[PDB]
């Protein structure tokens, strides 16, 4: 699963396509701003606040 | 990944394969005293070479 090329497309075409669709079209993480750190501060520990 | 156990199967870095039929017996073979010996290499399976 972690290397797509190991799955042989002559034996497992549907499963090769399923691994390939997972590797392409899985939703990407993102980030968004909130509150205000200027006057409220923030309790963020492992992220920028 | 092709599954065919009639001819070979893998056990992890060791392939086994059923060898067979170096010789072939005809109809007129009748175990006569001048017949050539076949050394049990005309059966279905005489060995399993790994």
Could you please describe the fold and organization of this structure?
The PDB classes it as viral protein. Keywords: mammalian reovirus, cryo-em, RNA dependent RNA polymerase, transcription, viral protein. The entry is titled "In situ structure of polymerase complex of mammalian reovirus in the pre-elongation state". The structure is cut from a larger assembly and holds chains A (49 residues) and B (50 residues). Chain A starts with 12 loop residues before the first helix and ends in a 24-residue tail after the last helix. Chain A has one helix at 13-25. Chain A is rod-shaped, with a radius of gyration of 20 Å. Chain A contains one helix and no strands. Chain A has 49 residues and is mainly α. By secondary structure, chain B is mainly β. In chain B, strand 1 and strand 2 (15-17) form a beta hairpin. Chain B is elongated. The two termini of chain B are 19 Å apart. The chains hardly touch.
Key words describing this protein structure:
2 chains; A: 49 residues; mainly alpha; 27% helix; B: 50 residues; mainly beta
Question: Would you kindly provide a brief summary of this structure?
Answer:
This is part of a larger assembly, with chains A (49 residues) and B (50 residues). With 49 residues, chain A is mostly helical.
């Amino acid at each position: 699963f972690m290397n797509i090329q190991l799955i042989s497309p002559i034996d497992a075409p549907i499963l090769r396509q399923w691994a390939e669709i997972i590797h392409r079209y899985w939703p990407n993480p993102s980030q968004i701003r909130y509150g205000t750190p200027n006057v409220f501060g923030s309790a963020n520990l492992f992220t920028p606040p | 990944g092709a599954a065919l156990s009639q001819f070979f199967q893998s056990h992890g870095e060791v392939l086994e394969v059923a060898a067979g039929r170096k010789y072939l017996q005809m109809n007129n073979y009748s175990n006569d005293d001048d017949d050539p010996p076949l050394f049990a290499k005309d059966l279905s399976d005489y060995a399993k070479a790994f």
